[PDB]
Enzyme design. Structure first.
Site, PDB file in Angstrom:
ATOM      1  N   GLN A  19      32.279  48.962  35.577  1.00 56.90           N
ATOM      2  CA  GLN A  19      31.505  47.824  36.071  1.00 56.90           C
ATOM      3  C   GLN A  19      30.009  48.060  36.289  1.00 56.90           C
ATOM      4  OE1 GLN A  19      32.032  47.384  40.830  1.00 56.90           O
ATOM      5  NE2 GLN A  19      33.987  47.431  39.739  1.00 56.90           N
ATOM      6  N   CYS A  25      34.183  43.879  40.283  1.00 62.83           N
ATOM      7  CA  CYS A  25      35.545  44.393  40.351  1.00 62.83           C
ATOM      8  C   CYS A  25      36.577  43.269  40.515  1.00 62.83           C
ATOM      9  CB  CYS A  25      35.682  45.428  41.483  1.00 62.83           C
ATOM     10  SG  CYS A  25      35.108  44.907  43.114  1.00 62.83           S
ATOM     11  N   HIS A 164      37.134  45.556  47.883  1.00 61.39           N
ATOM     12  CA  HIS A 164      37.118  45.990  46.489  1.00 61.39           C
ATOM     13  C   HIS A 164      38.335  45.507  45.696  1.00 61.39           C
ATOM     14  CE1 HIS A 164      35.830  48.366  43.134  1.00 61.39           C
ATOM     15  NE2 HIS A 164      36.856  49.196  43.187  1.00 61.39           N
ATOM     16  N   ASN A 184      41.356  51.149  38.634  1.00 64.51           N
ATOM     17  CA  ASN A 184      40.037  50.824  39.180  1.00 64.51           C
ATOM     18  C   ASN A 184      39.111  50.448  38.022  1.00 64.51           C
ATOM     19  OD1 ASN A 184      38.006  50.544  41.111  1.00 64.51           O
ATOM     20  ND2 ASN A 184      37.537  52.738  41.199  1.00 64.51           N
TER      21      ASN A 184
HETATM   22  N1  LIG Z   1      30.175  42.720  45.617  1.00 60.33           N
HETATM   23  C1  LIG Z   1      31.209  43.149  45.315  1.00 60.33           C
HETATM   24  C2  LIG Z   1      32.529  43.677  44.940  1.00 60.33           C
HETATM   25  N2  LIG Z   1      33.565  43.144  45.850  1.00 60.33           N
HETATM   26  C3  LIG Z   1      34.265  41.962  45.726  1.00 60.33           C
HETATM   27  O1  LIG Z   1      34.081  41.200  44.795  1.00 60.33           O
HETATM   28  C4  LIG Z   1      35.226  41.653  46.771  1.00 60.33           C
HETATM   29  C5  LIG Z   1      36.655  41.752  46.149  1.00 60.33           C
HETATM   30  S1  LIG Z   1      37.890  41.338  47.426  1.00 60.33           S
HETATM   31  O2  LIG Z   1      37.607  42.015  48.679  1.00 60.33           O
HETATM   32  O3  LIG Z   1      39.144  41.789  46.946  1.00 60.33           O
HETATM   33  C6  LIG Z   1      38.034  39.521  47.616  1.00 60.33           C
HETATM   34  C7  LIG Z   1      38.855  39.067  48.842  1.00 60.33           C
HETATM   35  C8  LIG Z   1      40.073  38.373  48.636  1.00 60.33           C
HETATM   36  C9  LIG Z   1      40.845  37.943  49.737  1.00 60.33           C
HETATM   37  C10 LIG Z   1      40.405  38.203  51.051  1.00 60.33           C
HETATM   38  C11 LIG Z   1      39.197  38.893  51.270  1.00 60.33           C
HETATM   39  C12 LIG Z   1      38.408  39.333  50.169  1.00 60.33           C
HETATM   40  O4  LIG Z   1      37.224  40.023  50.360  1.00 60.33           O
HETATM   41  C13 LIG Z   1      36.148  39.643  51.237  1.00 60.33           C
HETATM   42  F1  LIG Z   1      35.066  40.473  51.021  1.00 60.33           F
HETATM   43  F2  LIG Z   1      36.531  39.825  52.463  1.00 60.33           F
HETATM   44  O5  LIG Z   1      34.942  40.353  47.338  1.00 60.33           O
HETATM   45  C14 LIG Z   1      33.799  40.194  48.111  1.00 60.33           C
HETATM   46  O6  LIG Z   1      33.133  41.168  48.458  1.00 60.33           O
HETATM   47  N3  LIG Z   1      33.407  38.927  48.511  1.00 60.33           N
HETATM   48  C15 LIG Z   1      32.136  38.682  49.281  1.00 60.33           C
HETATM   49  C16 LIG Z   1      31.364  37.395  48.807  1.00 60.33           C
HETATM   50  O7  LIG Z   1      32.239  36.250  48.668  1.00 60.33           O
HETATM   51  C17 LIG Z   1      33.300  36.521  47.731  1.00 60.33           C
HETATM   52  C18 LIG Z   1      34.209  37.694  48.230  1.00 60.33           C
END
Ligand SMILES: N#CCNC(=O)[C@H](CS(=O)(=O)Cc1ccccc1OC(F)F)OC(=O)N1CCOCC1
Length: 217
Positions: A19, A25, A164, A184
């Site tokens: 990535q 991710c 993540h 990953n």
């Molecule tokens: N950058 C970067 C790489 N990280 C990301 O894409 C993460 C991936 S996740 O934690 O699995 C998404 C997620 C799903 C359900 C509940 C809480 C989550 O995760 C949440 F962070 F709690 O999402 C996020 O960080 N988000 C923040 C912004 O809005 C979309 C989700």
């Protein structure tokens, strides 16, 4: 249920992706899950466009491209959009771009997705065994995660606050330690050729069973 599972052995997992400095991710996790379903349905293993999701599954889906997104909303975008392009036709650039989807390069579709109950590792086990790889989120903020090389990953400081997106492609037991086999998206240099065995049945370690979901064709 089988004591162990590994979808790579069934040719349902594409190569590990890298990535770069783009937090995509969530998109890699999403396409990875659909990739297995596509293989089960058509017999062909094809990498799907994570970039397609980054550029197109945006605001309307609560996603922020290189700044994070949801695997579930990504699945809904594919449903709403009636398709997703192949990786080859819409290559990954590790940056936010204008949506360039074109149905002539469509390589897969999605009719629905399912979200598993929070923290139930037994339910997740059944899904991985009977449905296929499952998209999940894990707490990957701890220094030890970046440095993982082998064995089963167990970190006392892990939490259930996921940040993540990854893909559970199997499970099993190694030298008395149960684990989840996770794909990953930090390239082949990370952990075991891009994979990491994370502790299973250890109190929803790192929140691996917190938010699991899988799509269907
Ligand atoms: N950058 C970067 C790489 N990280 C990301 O894409 C993460 C991936 S996740 O934690 O699995 C998404 C997620 C799903 C359900 C509940 C809480 C989550 O995760 C949440 F962070 F709690 O999402 C996020 O960080 N988000 C923040 C912004 O809005 C979309 C989700």
């Amino acid at each position: 249920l089988p004591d162990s599972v590994d979808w790579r052995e069934k040719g349902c997992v594409t190569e590990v992706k890298y990535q770069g400095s783009c937090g995509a991710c969530w998109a890699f996790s999403a396409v990875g899950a659909l990739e297995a379903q596509l293989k089960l349905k058509t017999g062909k293993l094809v990498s799907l466009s994570a970039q397609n999701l980054v550029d197109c599954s945006t605001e309307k889906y609560g996603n922020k491209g290189c700044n994070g997104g949801f695997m579930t909303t990504a699945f809904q975008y594919i449903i709403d959009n009636k398709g997703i392009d192949s990786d080859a036709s819409y290559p990954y650039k590790a940056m936010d771009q204008k949506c360039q989807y074109d149905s002539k390069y469509r390589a897969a579709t999605c009719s629905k997705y399912t979200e598993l109950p929070y923290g139930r590792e037994d339910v997740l086990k059944e899904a991985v065994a009977n449905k296929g790889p499952v998209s999940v989120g894990v707490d990957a903020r701890h220094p030890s995660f970046f440095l993982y090389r082998s064995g089963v990953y167990y970190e006392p400081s892990c939490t259930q606050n996921v940040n993540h997106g990854v893909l559970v492609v199997g499970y099993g037991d190694l030298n008395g330690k149960e684990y989840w086999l996770v794909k990953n998206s930090w390239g082949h240099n990370f952990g075991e050729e891009g994979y990491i065995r994370m502790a299973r049945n250890k109190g929803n370690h790192c929140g691996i069973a917190s938010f699991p979901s899988y799509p269907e064709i």
